[PDB]
């Protein structure tokens, strides 16, 4: 029930909502989570994605190519899609596998890559990215940061 996020994971989800609204959509799917991860800018996910050349403008262009622009209709409820909810479940699994009870930005990214199917996955493929390498680089960075 969404009680297991850190502040920075909530910040990524807020940015995913804003990315939905920017294109006139009123849902958060895997692809909006991807855009929020890239654009958040400060967390582990953002700093891995940037290192790997995954650029927000490029990702936005690919997202729009696949889903287009919506009605611009805004509703206060902005629910997650089923695949996004699956990503959130997988993100909690990844957090616990890494010794955390709460989901941070890296866990959202790891969960996104594990779901592996859906608009975000297609965007990453279209950008030339390799999800297995992204995973490896996330876990590398988490380990490097252990003394803090």
Numbering used by the authors: 94 to 241
Quote from the publication.
The 1.20 Å structure showed AtClpC1 N-terminal domain (residues 94–238) to be a α-helical domain, having 66% helical content and made up of eight tightly packed α-helices: α1 (E100-L116), α2 (T123-E133), α3 (I137-M145), α4 (L149-I160), α5 (P175-L191), α6 (S198-E208), α7 (V212-L220) and α8 (P224-N238). The two central helices: α2 and α6 which are rich in the hydrophobic residues Leu and Ile contribute significantly to the packing. The fold of AtClpC1 NTD contains two repeats of a 4-helix motif that share 46% sequence identity and 84.1% similarity in a region of 63-residue overlap. A 14-residue long loop between α4 and α5 connects the two repeats. The two halves that stay in close proximity are related by a pseudo two-fold axis of symmetry. Strong sequence identity and conservation of secondary structure between the two halves suggest the possibility of an early evolutionary gene duplication event that could have resulted in this repeated motif, as has been predicted for the N-terminal domain of bacterial ClpA and other ClpC proteins. A query to the DALI database and PDBeFold server with AtClpC1 NTD structure coordinates yielded NTD of mycobacterial ClpC1 and other Gram-positive bacterial ClpC as the most similar structures. So we presume CymA would bind readily to AtClpC1 NTD as well.
In this context, the plant caseinolytic protease (Clp) complex plays an important role in degradation of accumulated and misfolded proteins in chloroplasts wherein the chaperones aid in ATP-dependent unfolding of protein substrates to be degraded by the associated protease machinery. The N-terminal domain of ClpC1 is known to perform the regulatory function of substrate recognition, either directly or indirectly through the adaptor proteins ClpS1/ClpF for which it becomes a binding platform161718, whereas no adaptor proteins have so far been reported for ClpD. Here we report and analyse the crystal structures of AtClpC1 residues 94 to 238 and AtClpD residues 79 to 233 (hereafter mentioned as AtClpC1 NTD and AtClpD NTD respectively) that correspond to the ClpC NTD of eubacteria.
